[PDB]
Amino acid sequence: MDDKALLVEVQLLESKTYHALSNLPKARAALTSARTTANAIYCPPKLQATLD
Amino acid sequence: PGRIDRKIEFPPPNEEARLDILKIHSRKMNLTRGINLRKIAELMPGASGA
Amino acid sequence: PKNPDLRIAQLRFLLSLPEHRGDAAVRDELMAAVRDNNMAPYYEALCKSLDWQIDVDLLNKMKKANEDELKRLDEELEDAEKNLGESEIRDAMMAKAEYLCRIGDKEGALTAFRKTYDKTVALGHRLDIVFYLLRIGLFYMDNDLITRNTEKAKSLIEEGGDWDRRNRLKVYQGLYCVAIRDFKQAAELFLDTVSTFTSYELMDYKTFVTYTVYVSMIALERPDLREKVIKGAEILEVLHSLPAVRQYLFSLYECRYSVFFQSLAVVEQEMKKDWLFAPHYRYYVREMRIHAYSQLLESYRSLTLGYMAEAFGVGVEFIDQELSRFIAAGRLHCKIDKVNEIVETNRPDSKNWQYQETIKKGDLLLNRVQKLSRVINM
Amino acid sequence: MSEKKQPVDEDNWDDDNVEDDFSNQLRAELEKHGYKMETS
Numbered sequence: 001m002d003d004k005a006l007l008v009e010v011q012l013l014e015s016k017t018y019h020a021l022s023n024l025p026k027a028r029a030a031l032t033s034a035r036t037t038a039n040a041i042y043c044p045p046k047l048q049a050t051l052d
Numbered sequence: 053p054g055r056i057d058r059k060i061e062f063p064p065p066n067e068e069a070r071l072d073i074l075k076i077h078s079r080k081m082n083l084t085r086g087i088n089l090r091k092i093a094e095l096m097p098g099a100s101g102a
Numbered sequence: 103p104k105n106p107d108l109r110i111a112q113l114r115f116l117l118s119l120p121e122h123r124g125d126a127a128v129r130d131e132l133m134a135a136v137r138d139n140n141m142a143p144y145y146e147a148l149c150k151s152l153d154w155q156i157d158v159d160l161l162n163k164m165k166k167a168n169e170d171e172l173k174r175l176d177e178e179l180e181d182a183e184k185n186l187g188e189s190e191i192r193d194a195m196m197a198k199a200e201y202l203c204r205i206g207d208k209e210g211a212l213t214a215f216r217k218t219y220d221k222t223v224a225l226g227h228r229l230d231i232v233f234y235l236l237r238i239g240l241f242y243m244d245n246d247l248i249t250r251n252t253e254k255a256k257s258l259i260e261e262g263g264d265w266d267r268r269n270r271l272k273v274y275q276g277l278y279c280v281a282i283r284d285f286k287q288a289a290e291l292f293l294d295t296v297s298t299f300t301s302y303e304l305m306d307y308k309t310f311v312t313y314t315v316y317v318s319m320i321a322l323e324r325p326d327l328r329e330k331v332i333k334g335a336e337i338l339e340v341l342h343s344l345p346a347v348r349q350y351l352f353s354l355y356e357c358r359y360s361v362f363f364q365s366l367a368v369v370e371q372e373m374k375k376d377w378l379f380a381p382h383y384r385y386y387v388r389e390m391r392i393h394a395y396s397q398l399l400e401s402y403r404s405l406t407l408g409y410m411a412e413a414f415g416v417g418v419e420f421i422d423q424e425l426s427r428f429i430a431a432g433r434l435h436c437k438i439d440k441v442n443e444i445v446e447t448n449r450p451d452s453k454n455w456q457y458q459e460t461i462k463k464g465d466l467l468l469n470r471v472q473k474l475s476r477v478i479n480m
Numbered sequence: 481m482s483e484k485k486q487p488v489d490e491d492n493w494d495d496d497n498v499e500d501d502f503s504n505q506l507r508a509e510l511e512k513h514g515y516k517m518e519t520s
Binding site for chain 1: 335336338339342
Binding site for chain 3: 490491493494495498501502505507508509510513514516517519520
């Protein structure tokens, strides 16, 4: 779809649960795909520290 | 033209030619499945081939 | 047709050979047998199960209908449509044999596969037929067909296409676990566990994880077992689903031996429900019981078997008799004792180990050039 | 090359070393080997 801002959070929420299943290389992979998506939004005003 | 008689250009390749060179160098590579090499060469308007 | 088919061959085993187990397999096989049009193999299976029931002639005319309905298709096809090779005659007549693999016995299916194998020219259609032979040789565990076509899959086919071989990597070591090769060849190429969806070519995933974790702790003790299965993370996801399997792992690695036997007790009894099962159970447990003893006698050289009476289980005389059987077996390199009640060990040194290997290999090559010198000189 | 000394002449596929070791020691290995603990 067209939206971008909601995608940064749900990529980030999966990086919690792949780490919650103790899958460390996949959670590194899903986090980096959340990084390259995060750089094109008006505000990640609180989602920045969540990502950090 | 007494010395050099054939003067041969080398333009940048076409979409079919970019498709073919991609087939050559991905030969030893290990492709997954479900993969379209044609759209990749469509993404290069004026590549070199190197 | 063949794709969810292997669960049937589980219930063929589970109903038959444990004679007490005749309660629940027939409850979800017969309703599956009146489904799926399964008609040719179950006659002997109905003999070992409850004797007869008249649904036989019901699906006999129904298996004759779909036989004739597609037989009249591809005979009219070959008499009207004139392409060959991988033509419409091809995929109709492989649909006849895949009607045979789902319904009929193996014999009509395999001769139709050999009928259609030499009519092909593309290796991808050849390998998919060899997929079918390997699966029907795995249905009826026939060890003659599976040894042949794997060599056909290696040599004659898979110098071409790619990553339809990992589907048969799981089949090469499906052969090795139904064989007694529970040692290294199974656990080596089970180790690439990146094949997820429970397909025909990946018959199950979660039980595949249990298969590759049972066989894994025999291939290697500590030449970095812990990196490939314990520091491995994609394996660690799905053994976080199964608590008993993970407890069986970490008891052995973190040296909890008393709960290790209770875990190993569940494993051997749970192993009983398996159809590649005959090489496992009498050999698997005794190899692991002597595996736990060998590392436990390591780090000590004056052990007392009274310390085995509570740190380990119970049964002073039980440890005594089982070590005595294993020392006399030529394994388990230590020396049990009576009234001092001190399990002393003896392990060789470097030189006492190297001297033994050179005198074994020395007499081998000496005998080898004995016989060779007698072949020459008349 | 006869010697004229002829005149007379996994199921069990690799089992006989393991079979010569143990054969019939209540091979279920649970009902006593794991069930010591009610005796102790």
